[model samples]
Target: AAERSLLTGEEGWRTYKATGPRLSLPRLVALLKGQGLEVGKVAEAEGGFYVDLRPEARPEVAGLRLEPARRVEGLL
Candidate 1:
């Protein structure tokens, strides 16, 4: 399990990469909720799909990280 912050300062921005297999919307929401994170949206880019969470202080789970609500260019 590994996690890293985005940018350089603590702007409540973090990103978590999807591991293992593709997760369904319901299942992904359940996981994030269970882990104490209020997921805002799931986005996809050249790197694949990622979850963008609402700004909050919570411990991340699995081999993933999280970031705040931000507009991902390209994908919606």
Candidate 2:
């Protein structure tokens, strides 16, 4: 079984995207901006948008579901 990895308080960084049927961009962005982190250009995919945050800020928006942002094209 290949389970996905979650944000952790360790070395290295990770990227994630919102998980849901309907995409809400600002809802996530609004929530993120409050974190006061150095954000980058948001990546778009079939799922929704992408975000990269440090492990320290993971739990801030734990209310929303997220998945690993895959680095592939055409989205299968």
Candidate 3:
């Protein structure tokens, strides 16, 4: 909700650089998965990270929040 509320800019509502993890998608996938989080929509190039937290959401779009990740250190 907060992310989408960048005032819903002209370009489909999200803005620049919220995903600020130095970890790569593959590494991210691994690191994130270590906690058993539902890491998806993962990219190999340069992108931060996104969490959709919608239980029914899919990887093609939003990778919903997983129970394990939620229990990890400030991950969510």
Candidate 4:
């Protein structure tokens, strides 16, 4: 016998790196859900924020459209 996977073949862990300024809890939650990732739990620390990944919420991850910009020193 063999152990079983918590998720099916269609599901797996997906991480989203946080960027930009500090975001409110609600905003972060919305963003995660908007990205087609479920919200498990959130933990905050002095350094930054961290969000748990939820793959069972949606079948596929959401895509984002961002504007193309030139790299600037210490401005990213």
In the order shown, the candidates' Cα RMSDs to the true structure are 8.5, 7.4, 10.6, 10.2
Instruction: Give one digit per residue, the lDDT tens place, for model 3 in 1-76.
Output: 2323122222222322224335544654565455554533432323454332224322232232222122124645
Taken over the whole model, the C-alpha lDDT of each candidate is 0.51, 0.56, 0.34, 0.43
- For residues 16-62, write the lDDT of model 1, one tens digit per residue: 44433465556666777888776654556343346654344464656
> Which 10-residue span in candidate 3 carries the lowest summed lDDT?
63-72
Error of 3 at 54 (Å): 4.9
Highest-TM-score candidate: 2
* Pick by TM-score: 2 or 4, better one: 2
lDDT of 2 by residue, 1-76 (tens): 2222233322434567765545577667766776675444455656676766654455355466666565554946
Residue-level lDDT tens digits of model 4 in 7-56? 22123433333333556567766776876666554555234344445434
**TM-score of model 4 (CA atoms):** 0.43
Give each model's clash number.
Answer: 2, 0, 0, 0
Overall local distance difference test of candidate 4: 0.43
Q: Identify the superior model by TM-score, candidate 2 or candidate 3.
A: 2
Off by over 4 Å in 4: 1-19, 55-76
Instruction: Kindly give the stretch of ten consecutive residues in candidate 1 with the minimal lDDT sum.
Output: 1-10
If scored against the real structure, what TM-score would every candidate get? Answer: 0.44, 0.49, 0.32, 0.43
Q: Which pairs clash (backbone N, Cα, C closer than 3 Å) in model 4?
A: none
Ranking by TM-score: 2, 1, 4, 3
- Candidate with better lDDT, 1 vs 2: 2
